[PDB]
Amino acid sequence: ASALLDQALELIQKGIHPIKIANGFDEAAKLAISKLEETCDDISASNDELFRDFLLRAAKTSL
Amino acid sequence: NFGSQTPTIVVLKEGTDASQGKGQIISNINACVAVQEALKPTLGPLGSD
Ligand SMILES: [Mg+2]
């Protein structure tokens, strides 16, 4: 969030209206989510034996 | 006659403001314009908060 505000301060000094800055972030947010959604894959095809492995993978990262 | 002071009676209780003269109704206009100054930039979809 602060990174978005740091890049917005540079655009405000250039004379851009703040609403035009917020309108660009809303359109760019949906383009990033739709791009990452196509790259990921579905792990639900695996059985319960492999499904436990994916739970161990994301556990060690949050710890 | 009850004292050498003999105070002068004031029509209104102490603390009351004054009026008439010139600019009394103008004081009410500048009060509404100053409040309007805050609500002007909030007009329009590109307005601020
Ligand atoms: Mg974490």
Q: Which token pair is B48?
A: 């601020």
CA–CA dist A46, A16 (Å, integer): 50
Whether A42 and A48 have beta carbons less than 8 Å apart is answered as no
Helices (H), B1-49: 24-39
Whether A43 and A52 have beta carbons less than 8 Å apart is answered as no
Contact B45 A19 (CB under 8 A): yes
CA–CA dist A8, A18 (Å, integer): 8
Residues in CB range of A20: below 8 A, 6 or more apart: B46
The 3-state DSSP class for residue A42 equals: coil
Chain A nearest-CA distance from B27, in A, is 35
Q: Which token pair is B43?
A: 């007009």
Experimental method: cryo-EM
CA–CA dist A28, A24 (Å, integer): 6
Sequence length of chain B is 49
